[PDB]
Amino acid sequence: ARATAGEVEGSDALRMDADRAEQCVDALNADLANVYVLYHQLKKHHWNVEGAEFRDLHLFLGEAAETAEEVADELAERVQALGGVPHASPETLQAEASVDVEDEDVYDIRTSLANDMAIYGDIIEATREHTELAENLGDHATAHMLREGLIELEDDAHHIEHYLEDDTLVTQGAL
Amino acid sequence: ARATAGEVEGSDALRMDADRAEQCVDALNADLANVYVLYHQLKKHHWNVEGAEFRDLHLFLGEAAETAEEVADELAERVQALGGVPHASPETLQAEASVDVEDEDVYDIRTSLANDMAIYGDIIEATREHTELAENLGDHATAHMLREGLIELEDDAHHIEHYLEDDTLVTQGAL
Amino acid sequence: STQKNARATAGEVEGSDALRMDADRAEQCVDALNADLANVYVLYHQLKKHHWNVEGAEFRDLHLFLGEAAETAEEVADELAERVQALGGVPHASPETLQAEASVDVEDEDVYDIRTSLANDMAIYGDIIEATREHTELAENLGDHATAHMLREGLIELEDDAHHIEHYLEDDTLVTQGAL
Amino acid sequence: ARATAGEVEGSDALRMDADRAEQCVDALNADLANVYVLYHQLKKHHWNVEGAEFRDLHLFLGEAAETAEEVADELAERVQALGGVPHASPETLQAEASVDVEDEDVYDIRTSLANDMAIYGDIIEATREHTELAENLGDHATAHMLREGLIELEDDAHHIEHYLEDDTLVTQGAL
Amino acid sequence: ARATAGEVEGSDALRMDADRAEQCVDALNADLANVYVLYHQLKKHHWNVEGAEFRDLHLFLGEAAETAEEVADELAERVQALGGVPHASPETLQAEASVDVEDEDVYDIRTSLANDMAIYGDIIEATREHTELAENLGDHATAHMLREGLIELEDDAHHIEHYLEDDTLVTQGAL
Amino acid sequence: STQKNARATAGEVEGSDALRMDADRAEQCVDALNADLANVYVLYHQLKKHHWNVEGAEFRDLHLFLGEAAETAEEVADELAERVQALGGVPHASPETLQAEASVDVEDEDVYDIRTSLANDMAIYGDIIEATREHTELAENLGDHATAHMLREGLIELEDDAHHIEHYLEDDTLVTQGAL
Amino acid sequence: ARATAGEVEGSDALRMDADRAEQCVDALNADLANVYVLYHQLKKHHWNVEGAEFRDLHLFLGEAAETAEEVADELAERVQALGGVPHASPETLQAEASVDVEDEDVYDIRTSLANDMAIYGDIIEATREHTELAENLGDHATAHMLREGLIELEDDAHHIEHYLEDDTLVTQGAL
Amino acid sequence: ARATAGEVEGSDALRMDADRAEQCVDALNADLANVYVLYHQLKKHHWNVEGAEFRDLHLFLGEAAETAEEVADELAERVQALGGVPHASPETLQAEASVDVEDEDVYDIRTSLANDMAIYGDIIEATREHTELAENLGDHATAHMLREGLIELEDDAHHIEHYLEDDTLVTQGAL
Amino acid sequence: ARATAGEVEGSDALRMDADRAEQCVDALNADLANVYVLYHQLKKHHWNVEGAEFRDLHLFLGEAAETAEEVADELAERVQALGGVPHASPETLQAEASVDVEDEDVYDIRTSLANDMAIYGDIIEATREHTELAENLGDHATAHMLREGLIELEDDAHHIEHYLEDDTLVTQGAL
Amino acid sequence: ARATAGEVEGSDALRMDADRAEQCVDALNADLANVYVLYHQLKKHHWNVEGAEFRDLHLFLGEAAETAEEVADELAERVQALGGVPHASPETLQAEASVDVEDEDVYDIRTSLANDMAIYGDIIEATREHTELAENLGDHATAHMLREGLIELEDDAHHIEHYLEDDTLVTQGAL
Amino acid sequence: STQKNARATAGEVEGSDALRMDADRAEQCVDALNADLANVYVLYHQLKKHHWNVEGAEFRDLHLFLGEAAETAEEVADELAERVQALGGVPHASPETLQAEASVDVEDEDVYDIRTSLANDMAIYGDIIEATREHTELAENLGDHATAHMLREGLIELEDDAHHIEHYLEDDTLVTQGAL
Numbered sequence A, B, D, E, G, H, I, J: 001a002r003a004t005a006g007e008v009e010g011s012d013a014l015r016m017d018a019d020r021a022e023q024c025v026d027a028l029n030a031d032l033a034n035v036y037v038l039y040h041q042l043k044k045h046h047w048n049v050e051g052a053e054f055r056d057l058h059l060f061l062g063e064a065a066e067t068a069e070e071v072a073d074e075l076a077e078r079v080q081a082l083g084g085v086p087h088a089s090p091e092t093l094q095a096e097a098s099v100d101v102e103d104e105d106v107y108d109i110r111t112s113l114a115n116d117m118a119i120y121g122d123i124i125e126a127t128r129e130h131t132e133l134a135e136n137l138g139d140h141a142t143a144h145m146l147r148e149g150l151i152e153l154e155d156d157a158h159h160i161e162h163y164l165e166d167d168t169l170v171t172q173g174a175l
Numbered sequence C, F, K: 001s002t003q004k005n006a007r008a009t010a011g012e013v014e015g016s017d018a019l020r021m022d023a024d025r026a027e028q029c030v031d032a033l034n035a036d037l038a039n040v041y042v043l044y045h046q047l048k049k050h051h052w053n054v055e056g057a058e059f060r061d062l063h064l065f066l067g068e069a070a071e072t073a074e075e076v077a078d079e080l081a082e083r084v085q086a087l088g089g090v091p092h093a094s095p096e097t098l099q100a101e102a103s104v105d106v107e108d109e110d111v112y113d114i115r116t117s118l119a120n121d122m123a124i125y126g127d128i129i130e131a132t133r134e135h136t137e138l139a140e141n142l143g144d145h146a147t148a149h150m151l152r153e154g155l156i157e158l159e160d161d162a163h164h165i166e167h168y169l170e171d172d173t174l175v176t177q178g179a180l
């Protein structure tokens, strides 16, 4: 093997010793696994959403899935740049994730979105914590990247909350 | 008259004898007619859709109509390329169509979409039969084209199906 | 007069020598455009409000529609303002002035449900629409065909938004009691 | 009313309790009101600027007005995402703003720009303070957004300072 | 000669009898001539502008000339569409123009702009009279076009006015 | 049945009335597409891995090629998934499900050298390629020409990537012992 | 030599045995030779077309040439992917082609176009046969590609048929 | 006056002495006058072309006009850069031109095109002489520019030659 | 035959007598032939390149071939514009070429590139001689064009040189 | 002089007193000098890289040089905005830089990249330190900008590390 | 010789076999292009300086013009450098080398007013312009028509910037004592 899962060597290019790096690496790898389960669940919901608002939600979820994937890509890359090994296989991702994932049945849109919302909220809190860890290790590139992904993820989370709110243009008359 | 409605001459350029071509042309012309009535009814629905979801439907139906118009264009041009006369006038198109077309009143969006879905379905089934007919005549360009049209029509028909499905973000509480 | 601090005084209209529009003529258009500006900026700020706050099953579609309507209102305000200034007047500028010179009704600061908010917007659109039609006659009748043309270009976009809101509020939906 | 001006409910999506949220909300809402008076005053100046440098300044002010508006939009959105109500009507914005606003007369360009400069400087200082408040509440998405808007606003502020500086290509000979 | 300078045949396609058309054509042709001399003098000023503001003026005047050329093109094409002969040669255009044109010397930028403003003004006033003439002839396409030209010409003329106004960022201190 | 929590149960296939595809027919395609989906998502995740980790004298070129191959795999997965759903089935969704339903071989979590990694990728591509060809016959033979066409459009892109890897692994290079 | 002309190794990556691969390669290489003479002769007519329609023809033949080049490239790449050696040198291409090629003299546009039409017809019938061959060999990617090439070629061939048809706007009167 | 027609001051910035500069300026200004009559006459034929090829010609002449305008602009700017005064008014341009210009009547497309071809030929021979002149004066930027103008003009002139060649798709039969 | 291979008529439009033109045409036609064989061999190499660097070479050689094709197009069109007959058929192009062309076998990448470099070099040297020939004939458009082609050919030839140079990131350790 | 090298006046626009500013100014100016030596050395390497991977590295280095230049531009601008004078001349930049720069000889690619890597690592560490200095002075715009440049610079640094790693597709068999 | 650490030594010129340019010929162009490179990079760095520092009533227009002139200088430097390298020489690289090999005058580190700064820039442009004209003759006379063409393409852009500065410095303005 060139590198072993779980090892972190730091980077001589980035002047980050393996001590410091391993702390960011652990945080990032946890985040990577959560965000890729997120990705996969947003894709599920995007594939299956049906009903009166489905096209708008299909588009929003497809976008949300794209932003998770990009976040995952930046996490994994940064793990690798810091001398670590990002979690790669799908069973590894889901094993290492802490967030809850739906079973294989398809649920109605309100249920599915409320499940997503819970994943986002967990990722959001973790990411906040990890940006502080990064800044306190003086890894400002990591901290900045994490915040750049945070703000995207909060925006999608906030979208889902709004989708779920108790207002609508529909009236009992229109029914 | 440079050509007469109903005649088919084949094409020298495309090495398609008139016997061979006539058989494709009848299938393509029947598809054209149904596709243009589909285009006219999607346009109607696009113009008139109202209510809580109307803007997203207005956009979808606008797009679906453009996709129908393009399929119609490709069908008509292939008719012409194969030495036939594509059906051209609106009254001809409706008369040669086999699909049902709404009267001039405006129905609520569900009914309107359900009417569109049935047109798609007829078109989808016929196109499938016509791609086989084209392949068996060795007309692999026609088949290919038919299949590229089909996959866009099936995508739109399936979107309509989802819009009609029995799910929603709406709750009695939001009402 | 040569000693005033201000380069121009609110409410004055000087016409333009570049545009060959005398102050008399210009003042009449300026009075119309300034009133429209004010209503249009209050329109903008309320559409923003509704863009920011909209929630529920259609929110995202509405967020985007209202953010685009807000941008169109802003652009209409910009054109009106610039035309005031070109005609030698002073476009109403500060938010307090814009709101005070507006004749349309503004929501208080609370957030209402989406139907109520849209209906309030619809009312504002209606008012502006009627006034602009009057104002385009006024301009054509003064021979100020640029102002007229411009007012009409803004009118068609406002009418389009107004119409979209009327449709959003119509009594149809894909939703069924079964899906509930 | 769905929500009342002045209430802050936090967000369950963003895992931000109403305590924490209300502190960011107050800061952001103050900033929103200042930045929208800024917007409106930059539009004034853009509409009215005249003279030898007017086209360049018209363009710069129009841009500056666009960047303020975008900043306002991000502030207000974030207020709403955190469960607050962004200040919306124009008389509310101006009432809640702390910055000074010109009366309705049009002043010469040097005076107008110097007025703008003073608004920017106040917003800049406030924003610095608020980014620290955000980071100290662990609201890193807010802090990052505020800094992203800060850097835009400093750049326009710095532009105005340069416009006002005592150099020119003009000579008494050219006069 | 396929057509003779001065003749007007109307158009069958546009259902415009030659009496009706001739009246539009004379107004449009007189506008064309003035617009092309405007185009030539904006080009001149664009080529020669010098001094502290010259680059921004060079760009503005380049654009103003393109806007004039396009108005000229639309005028000339409408002449032709209505069965007339648009004035074509440079010596014809200048001879048929009513506006004043500088001699071949180069004047300072103020004088040059003031000369352009007077040309615009003449063009603006005539166009206004011509749009009414078009409307009253029922030629609503011509009127419409005239009004779309006018609003671009008025925008440029007003820009010139502002460049000439008595304000500046310049102070005696900066000198 | 009316009281199930789930709107659809994994493994069920309902066909589509919009697409005029009965459940019998649809189930056969759904079984093929679902198996392809799973292998394609494992393909994607391993290409990502290799994109992330590739090092050495050609890394940057490989990083970009593998990130683009990964995107193509993702898009193929998206189309397959969506087609499953359109045909009234339930696309395999969770990463654990995708990996469990995949027949292709996955690397363990260690990182290997670039030749080994590419060779492993090549194997996965080969498997998917063979299966897709079978699946396109299956669809054409069921008369589901949309599915067939789609499978072929995805096939040509996969084959292209597969081929690029075969070339990357060929025994030529500009490098000489002299340059070493 | 790394590979020998005529040899066909199949591909491990595409799971295509040399026996199956040789059969596609032989078809694809004949197509390639014909398509590349086609390309060179459309270039020629693109270079040389003169007369009353030339500019339009020059554009269409340039485009048709570029379509032929792109079909060639695909063909050649597919030969190579399948473990074969695409015909490469110009003398090889012309020797392996079955179509007729004009001598080096330049003919009038009608004759030149008729010549191309014949080349297109030959390629088109060959390609239909080859897409059956590929499909029957289970090589769907090759069949698909050939069909995508085919439709673009038939389109160009049909455009030539139309250029050559006995209609025109020109009248004896205009002459 | 800031500058006087006919005077040539050279440029300090370009290190071009007035003697050297005058010699380029005189060539460049003659070219400018010819190029601008050229422009006005292509506009004319663009406006007026009718008949069976008109739309294609209208487009090509519009483009050729715009190429001429761009060559003019370059020429004029170079005169000015070199301390000269580019000819500006339409009457000046036509007076300083050496080419022939049609009277105000409209001729048939062949005659009109033949007329333009003559203007192009004159400009083209003059420009070749001028690019030698510039080069021999060590003015390489002027020579380079003139050549870049030259190739675009020769291209257009050649396109006219082709439009006028004795070939066509039309046959007696189609008539 | 509308024209005969080998003849050169000059051009009236471009004021180039046939004596003058013939001399350019022979040089340009010889260049065309070599450029098209270069294009065919770059295409070959692009199709067949394999190994560690192959994708970046595949792209480079694809581009180099497009640059050759465009130079070929410009050469052939200039031949035609000057009243000559550009060499057109593949067997003619190879027969009129002076450069060496590989046989149909596939060689390793070094050998293949070295073969391309030698072709470039021949083309580069000839083009240099031809630009002088063009200038001395006063054909400054031809010269200019030749020089714009040359600088793109020299760029590609130099890229090949660098690919062949004796450096690498590869170490015996990485092996 | 308008300003003297080494003076820092702060900004009244940005509300940054000269105390605070001078601390950011010193840090930024040091960074500016390092990053511009970086720029210049990446350009060297980009100009000279040769061998089997040269085109890919040429492109990567050209990009890396562009990102350094942009970083330098943002640093220098921010120095000026804070009332300082950015180091401008090339001998000033290199004098003030602390990083090591190669002599004028060209070294092999591994050596050159390893030299670059060392510069990046020094800049990276310095930038981390300076972002903290900025945040601690409450200069959040500076801190954010520095981090935005940090993340770009780490990414290029990490690229170089990967280029230098001990893997390759090359085999002794391919040699 | 086989044991030198350096792959190429500054000041050497090897010509190119790809470009069929012998070392004798190449050395003459390389000497010209290297001197131009140096002046052009000092030009770039001073334009940057003036871009960064410009203040006053026209600053924004000047900032943008000088940032664009700086980019054009950089691109010209890039082409010259690359041509040196293609001809088998070693382009001057480090900032200290560039400044030392430059013949043009550089400002000290203080910041001057905009007229002074532009005038200094103008001088540098003038020098480069004259030298490039010589160098384009030199190249054409060596038969290196690529280098000549390239030098001329760079010349026209430099002349254009130089000319813009001359205009910026001309004695006209819209400003009047009345507006003061």
Ligand SMILES: [Fe+3]
Binding pocket: A073, A074, A077, F051, F067
């Ligand atoms: Fe990535």
Ligand SMILES: [Fe+3]
Binding pocket: A148, D148, J148
């Ligand atoms: Fe950012």
Ligand SMILES: [Fe+3]
Binding pocket: B073, B074, B077
């Ligand atoms: Fe069509």
Ligand SMILES: [Fe+3]
Binding pocket: B148, F153, G148
């Ligand atoms: Fe396709």
Ligand SMILES: [Fe+3]
Binding pocket: C078, C082, D046, D062
């Ligand atoms: Fe505006």
Ligand SMILES: [Fe+3]
Binding pocket: C051, C067, D073, D074, D077
């Ligand atoms: Fe918004």
Ligand SMILES: [Fe+3]
Binding pocket: E073, E074, E077, H046, H062
């Ligand atoms: Fe036109």
Ligand SMILES: [Fe+3]
Binding pocket: C153, E148
């Ligand atoms: Fe309009």
Ligand SMILES: [Fe+3]
Binding pocket: A046, A062, F078, F082
């Ligand atoms: Fe999708």
Ligand SMILES: [Fe+3]
Binding pocket: G073, G074, G077, I046, I062
């Ligand atoms: Fe290719």
Ligand SMILES: [Fe+3]
Binding pocket: E046, E062, H073, H074, H077
């Ligand atoms: Fe110009």
Ligand SMILES: [Fe+3]
Binding pocket: G046, G062, I073, I074, I077
């Ligand atoms: Fe061509």
Ligand SMILES: [Fe+3]
Binding pocket: H148, I148, K153
């Ligand atoms: Fe060029």
Ligand SMILES: [Fe+3]
Binding pocket: J073, J074, J077, K051, K067
């Ligand atoms: Fe900058």
Ligand SMILES: [Fe+3]
Binding pocket: J046, J062, K078, K082
């Ligand atoms: Fe470069």
Ligand SMILES: [Mg+2]
Binding pocket: A080, A081, A083, F055, J162
């Ligand atoms: Mg690594």
